[PDB]
Design a binder for this molecule. Sequence first.
Ligand SMILES: *C/C=C/c1cc2ccc(N(CC)CC)cc2oc1=O
Length: 133
Amino acid sequence: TRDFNGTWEMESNENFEGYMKALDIDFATRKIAVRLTFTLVIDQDGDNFKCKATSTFLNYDVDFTVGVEFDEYTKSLDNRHVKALVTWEGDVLVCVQKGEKENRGWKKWIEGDKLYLELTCGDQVCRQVFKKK
Ligand SMILES: *C/C=C/c1cc2ccc(N(CC)CC)cc2oc1=O
């Protein structure tokens, strides 16, 4: 299924610390943020996505259309400009964020009935798993 709609509650978070370090997030924001549990609210209609990730300290909002390149200013994270593009590889949603970081982006898929989110920057990979509320 290609249908990521819903409210998704974190059940596991692996190596968020390495992902944020590869982004050069400052120590005190990082040290707080690696403790956090996240909730995802995804609204998906065809190509049109609206995503909202929330925690007690870090929030991240993105809206995009599959197949349409867009500019992203990662204000809530590392404060960089990237050229982002989200496309389908089979049933995996793939985002590439072109900028000064290599292999920066993410991949999302459903396995069974959970949502998997893989965050990449440089040589670091973070894996998060969510359950549909
Ligand atoms: C449905 C895909 C949108 C989406 C992708 C995300 C990428 C990165 C992040 N974080 C915080 C965990 C790092 C910047 C969150 C996120 O959530 C989403 O809903």
